[PDB]
Symmetry: C2
Subunit: 162 residues, 2 copies
């Protein structure tokens, strides 16, 4: 089996990573474990680049802490000038794979409130993630993370990426 380390202790993300990894490498061919590391980025990353940078920082930290594993993966959430989304970064001994998730346009009021100091979690909590509430249940956070992990997994099963 492949030893896959997830730089997150969130069940939704853990679930998506496992599913995505099993779909590409085969059912039951992967063992997943979590490691809690620093993102070197603010709790609520702003902008595509900063959110992705955190994902990368988490992978580097996880990779150094557990050098025995085969894969290191992170999924970092962040907000835009009008939306929320996340970045998936994957690494193994040889290469890296990165992918940004689908975007969720956010209510004007919700946006200005997080732009005033509060984290999205609190503004939504005090008000599955936000995806579930706005897609009337038709989509789950795990469901969009999943597609993202599968995409960033591309380089690892296509020799063309060299």
């Amino acid at each position: 089996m492949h030893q896959v380390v997830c730089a997150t202790t969130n069940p939704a993300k853990i679930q998506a990573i496992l599913q995505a990894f099993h779909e590409i490498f085969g059912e039951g061919s992967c063992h997943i474990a979590s490691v809690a590391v620093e993102s070197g980025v603010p709790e609520q990353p702003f902008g595509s680049e900063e959110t992705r940078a955190g994902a990368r920082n988490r992978v580097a930290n996880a990779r150094r802490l557990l050098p025995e594993a085969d894969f290191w993966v992170a999924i970092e959430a962040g907000i835009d000038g009008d939306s929320t989304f996340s970045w998936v970064v994957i690494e193994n001994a040889s290469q890296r794979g990165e992918a940004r998730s689908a975007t969720l346009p956010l209510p004007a009021v919700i946006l200005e409130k997080v732009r005033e100091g509060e984290a999205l979690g609190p503004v939504m909590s005090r008000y599955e993630g936000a995806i579930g509430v706005f897609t009337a249940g038709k989509l789950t956070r795990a469901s969009v993370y999943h597609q993202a992990v599968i995409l960033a997994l591309s380089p690892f099963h296509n020799a063309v990426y060299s």
Copy 2:
């Protein structure tokens, strides 16, 4: 009630994704589809978030011009963002606008290299896979995810996310 949805595209994979999203949000057998071919007002191969987004908006506007008595107008435009490919979904109705980006797909350096040299993604992919009109079928998504995902599957979620404003009063 019953919605008249105009898709600013003829791409069967896109229409499939649109139709599915609307049924899931508004209910099966509640949306009649009408597809039209229109201009994007942007290059064959758009680059950047801004340019590809502009394409999708122009398509919707153009479509709205031709069939102004419809309820919804939707469009999906693909583009290159950094070392990957993705697309914007733009939706408009009588008084609102909803937009969302689909998940991105990282491309091999050899393909990007060929694309940045001047070739659009579809033709490059056609000589790598031998498949004609890849974008109207499984797409580069289907090829690099080994069928685990398809252009339709990925765009489906993006259309769901873009519909949010239309069924959630909060977006006021």
